[PDB]
Amino acid sequence: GSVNEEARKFTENVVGGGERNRLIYCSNLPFSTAKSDLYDLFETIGKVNNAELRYDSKGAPTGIAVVEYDNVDDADVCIERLNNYNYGGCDLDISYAKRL
């Protein structure tokens, strides 16, 4: 199925600066980002299995995304590698996802 409540619950009740777990919360994304470009962006750390962009009214972006890496050690690379990178003219903000 192309669009599901799971994909919403993957960006809903999510906030940055969590305990160490394979899930990464990104913020300050440029407004032109798309899930296919987002997979290619975090794939240079190692490996994305589940990644997605939070939407506002329906399907319009927000500047927020979540990325599941293969393993918590790839998130530790991400937090020094993208947390610090100019994407679309924006210094991205990266951390472990605390999903409530």
String of DSSP letters for 51-67: EEEEESSSS-EEEEEEE
As given in the structure block, the two tokens for residue 59 are 């399907």
Q: What does the radius of gyration of the chain's CA atoms come to, in whole angstroms?
A: 12
**Residue 57: C-alpha distances to residues 18, 54, 83 (Å):** 26, 10, 27
* Method for this entry: NMR
CA 47 to CA 40: how far, in whole Å?
Answer: 9
CA 15 to CA 97: how far, in whole Å?
Answer: 6
Classified as helix, coil or strand, 16 is strand
Residues 41, 44, 46, 47, CA torsion sign: positive
Number of domains in the chain: 1
Residues 41, 39, 81, 12, CA torsion sign: positive
CA 63 to CA 68: how far, in whole Å?
Answer: 17
* Domain containing residue 44: 1-100
Q: Residue 15's domain is classified under what CATH number?
A: 3.30.70.330
